[PDB]
Amino acid sequence: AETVSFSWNKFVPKQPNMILQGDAIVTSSGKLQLNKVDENGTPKPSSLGRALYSTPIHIWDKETGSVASFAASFNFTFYAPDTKRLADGLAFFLAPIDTKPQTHAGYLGLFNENESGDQVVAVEFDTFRNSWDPPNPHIGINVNSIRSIKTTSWDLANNKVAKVLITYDASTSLLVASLVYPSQRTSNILSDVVDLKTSLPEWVRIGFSAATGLDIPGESHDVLSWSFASNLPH
C-alpha cells in the first residue's frame, strides 16, 4: 500500500517542493499567483502559469492493475477588473512526470486543438465560452480533451474565496468535484466516471494551470492553500 499526503495553508517563496512554469510566482503574502499582473493587481492578456507538486504520484500499477484513490482540496480566488469580460479560467490536473505547458487561453495550458501532446485529466473552472463550451461559467471534468465529458454551472464570485474538494474513488472510478463559497453559502458539484489506466501514465504529477484571455485581461487566478492525499493499494 503506497500513500502520500501533504498540506499547507500558505505558499512560501522559492519553496523547493513546488515546480513553477510560465508566469507562476509565489508572492510574499503567501499566494500562488498563477498569472502575470501589473503593479496594482490587473492581469495581463495571454498570461499562463502552472505549478506542480514536486513529488510524482503513483496513480496506477501495470503489474497488479490496481488504481489509486485520492483527494485534493484548495482555496482559490480571482480578480476580474471587468466582470462582464472573463479570461478562460483555472484547473487542477494530473499529467505526466515531465509535463510542460500546452496551448494557453481557452485550452488553459492543459490541452491542444490537435489530437494531443500530453495525457491529461483535469477539473476546470472555466470563465469564458469557447465553441466547445456550454453557456456560462462552469465546472468541468476534462479527460484528454478541453471538451469536458460533463459540466455544471459555476456560481462565480469576483475576489471571494472558493473552497474546492476533488475526490477520486477507484472502486467506482468516480471523480467528484465540489466548489463552495462560504461567504455566499453557495455550492456546486459535478461527478463522472474516468478510467485512469487509459487516460494517464502510471506515475503523474498533479498541479494547477490558469490562463488569462488572449486579447483581453479577463481575470487573474490565485491559489491560497493546498491539500492532497493518495493511496495505491495492491
Partner: peptide, 4 residues
C-alpha cells in the same frame, strides 16, 4: 462566437 469563439475567438482567435
Amino acid at each position: 462566437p469563439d475567438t482567435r
